[PDB]
Symmetry: D2
Subunit: 295 residues, 4 copies
């Protein structure tokens, strides 16, 4: 037998960092969950019980904390690039580092219409994520995403005109509920190394903001023909607004809300134009994906 | 043997309702999870396989939907009272109904600074809950709560002056992080029946708003001596502002954030006044509770 | 305002203990999750920011580990009694201790038909739990339970003869699937203190075994008239077999499996006697409870 | 813009099937969760709001149930191949089908040492999974796996001889606890179509059994030098025993159990050879992966 691929590291490393402006007294917090997996000339650890080539995963953990202490942790695209570059530059035999970061929300509280200097609220489970692959001699590949953005619109969603055969029972409709959990990923052009990532630092936060804004506005305003059509509209607008992204990927469940026929009870009308009470379905769910690039 | 207590019903009933203003075109959605358990003269179902006394839990499910169709579902204190009263009035042998409702957030989206007429976002997993007990000949007992409100403050939390013995290793501190998940419950005076609940309907939403506001403001502004002291301050202010509540109950975990000593690495200073990077701890956690009433 | 009730402590304390027989070399492991909440003369911590009366929850955590080091951790009824008694005897002003323990399964592996001396498997998420309340001057109250025991029977479950009115759509049936998650609690007679708990130590493991055996055998062999009737049969047999228990409590969901009508497709027969493929329903679910004591 | 990739379908489709031997009366149940995603000439659904090319995901759901009614659902490698082949043969414009199946455990109960004819227990959350990719003109690719197999050994695990630099604090050890959640995947040689999958049907269950047996025996008996070395041993034995598998992939977390130093309390000895009580750590965790193929 032979080792065809191998990677190892530390997962689920929770990190908090605070910044304190001592001249205004305003504090700012950051909280993330980090995973770092390494690749390189490490097969003998597997095949020959040779631990001399292992950078202990405990040491990987320490390195994450030390790196956070000595460098900015925002935007996460930059922090992940710094972290990954460290491993490939420090260890001769380590040739690739894979960094995943999940950013948790801590939004400043407003007290009596004023932003509070050191108090925060978690306003949703939506996450801002990055995947950074640092590969010796091949630069830095970054994928940015938002996930866990849950939305619903109560009307201005349609689904008709689909294929009908002997497996089909679904009725066509011109007015339904649409709800989803948004997972959206934008893939950056390859960067040659950390200097080039630094040169583009302002683009990371602005592109995340744009992706979020485009997603919400398109969802709210599109008289949707299907999930497929709406998500394509989102992707094409993001691409038009940031030339340094190569592709946009959406993964959207269709979280179904079923009409409930009550006419068996005293002739109650609760379907079609009379539909007021619905049954949210936990499973199954549609799952729709697409990757959009430039022609 | 003998049956000492018994209750049965339907759990995890998901319900959506929409309201449509046809003159402005604005839509408003409500989504909840409902549980209904019944008590009464039903022991023979257990002891004698006598199903004639069982209101099927499937029928309980249908009744929830029909009741939502025919009545307002806000505020949840009212809906739960209506639902519970139905069972005890409709079935001679059913003497108590226990209704629990969890309200999920669907907050209207703002698009380009305007509130959107039919699009919504889940801005956090915080819930608004009610527990309504309807007991024949003893009125309606209501407990209202908010839960899942997650907050953090980065400073202006202290913990010193506690008991020190041979089991104690914890250092005193005058500056720490405080983070918690707020669980807060206010218990209403008993109501004689549904007429009296109706008479107080505006008090339910305003009291929820007050409890939320008092919790956030007290958390943000209190230079906290302990979790115990801060939560008492919250409870006493709520009681002072709504005479119809009898008690306020808080249940707060202390979600610990540990300092990380890095001095072993190149003499790095990351403790005390130099603390910038911390390790959020998933477990264990402190758990602090209290029930406050009027003297 | 006034403090009407208060308790505080440490939750989610994970503990492992190993026992090593150095003469046979066999090792035995135990793993649990522990919560300890205290009550007593502690109101001034809440009302007056007086921390002098607080036994720090960090110290409670240390005490759990020290107690596990110095005493047996099985059966959990004994360990919890020891732990709770410690707090009320050591601290004059602490008058009640509430201990909850969740026991996780580590079952010895059999390798080539031989029990392995130091290797274990988690064979299910079923838990063995205890709730121990130690109250100064009122002894020791213990509730033992098993939870997370998930079972299914494919036939020999019925449900007919229930109440039918204008809210009822459910069809009667003489052959259905029955599946549940068993939650079963037996409440011991009050014990006067730790000496009396020690005197009964062998009864704790045997009574847990009996409760488990009775539950599985009754579920498997009863031609069930309803969940209500089957659970009563379980409870009465447990009571008959351990005189020192006062009550038995069951809480059972009915996890529904729905028939799927396929006759719209090529006349396929998949209902009633022809039912082969079913749709497991995640929600809603029936919930059935009862407490049985002795006449 | 242009669509670079697209797939869509139904997720989280829960399915139960029963088999009844009417001559012995023994029943056998199967329960799974199924996902089916399709690819093909469907871009116009995204770009042009052309729903005529969409096989509705609701119809995909119906097809899963109908297919389960008309065909064996074991072994899952066969069922998934049948299901995927259906879509590419039935729809001219659908060229790839991706089927994922999760098999849930329902193990027959033994009552009084006899296997019960229709009663089952869920003995762990371990799953048996398959991923089947059916691609028009390129056959059938199958990946089989077991996941959620949680084990612990209390000794005969070591970790020393690793790289030590200024990021390293971890002590070497010759005796530690090792615990993991096993995720193991074996990739079958490509099959030309459904006829060839049928010809190998007995190999699927036997290879799953072998992979499970090899994993448990190797874990139990290996005096482990590291997670890396132990997992390689497992992979190489599986490859040696089934010539039709091309690669074996393991993904193993190292779920850490920390020693607790108690010497600060009355000189208690609980480290090294005296270690009896340990602290299970929920996070972070090591993560170790490798893919093994044949030289
Ligand atoms: O937007 C949708 N797309 C689909 O492909 C689909 N299929 C289905 O059943 N409902 C929907 N809705
Ligand atoms: O606010 C707190 N209260 C306590 O009772 C306690 N105990 C502890 O260890 N930390 C804290 N903090
Ligand atoms: O065993 C059952 N008990 C009930 O009370 C009930 N109600 C229902 O709809 N199904 C069942 N089944
Ligand atoms: O088996 C192990 N492998 C590692 O790579 C590692 N790293 C670490 O800190 N502990 C371990 N243990
Ligand atoms: Na390198
Ligand atoms: Na009544
Ligand atoms: Na005492
Ligand atoms: Na095809």
């Amino acid at each position: 037998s032979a080792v065809k691929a191998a990677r190892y590291g530390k997962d689920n490393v929770r990190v908090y960092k605070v910044h304190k402006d001592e001249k205004t007294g305003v504090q700012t917090v950051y909280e993330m969950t980090v995973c770092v997996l390494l690749e390189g000339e490490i097969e003998t650890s597997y095949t020959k019980a040779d631990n001399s080539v292992i950078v202990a995963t405990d040491s990987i953990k320490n390195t994450i904390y030390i790196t956070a202490k000595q460098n900015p942790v925002t935007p996460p695209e930059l922090f992940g690039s710094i972290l990954g570059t460290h491993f490939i530059e420090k260890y001769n035999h380590i040739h690739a580092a894979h960094v995943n970061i999940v950013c948790h929300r801590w939004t400043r509280m407003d007290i009596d219409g004023k932003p509070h200097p050191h108090s925060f609220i978690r306003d949703s489970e939506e996450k801002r994520n990055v995947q950074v692959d640092v590969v010796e001699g091949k630069g830095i590949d970054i994928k940015s995403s938002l996930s866990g953005l849950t939305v619903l619109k109560s009307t201005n969603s349609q689904f008709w005109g689909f294929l009908r055969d002997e497996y089909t029972t679904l009725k066509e409709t011109w007015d339904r509920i649409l709800s989803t959990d948004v997972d959206a990923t934008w893939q950056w052009k390859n960067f040659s190394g950390l200097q080039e990532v630094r040169s583009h630092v302002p683009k990371f936060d602005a592109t995340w903001a744009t992706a979020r804004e485009v997603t919400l506005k398109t969802f709210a305003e599109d008289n949707s023909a299907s999930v497929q059509a709406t998500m394509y509209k989102m992707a094409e607008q993001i691409l038009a607004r940031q030339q340094l992204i190569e592709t946009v990927e959406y993964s959207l469940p269709n979280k179904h809300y079923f009409e409930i026929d009550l006419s068996w009870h005293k002739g109650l009308q609760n379907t079609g134009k009379n539909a007021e009470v619905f049954a949210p379905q936990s499973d199954p769910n549609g799952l729709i994906k697409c990757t959009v690039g430039r022609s």
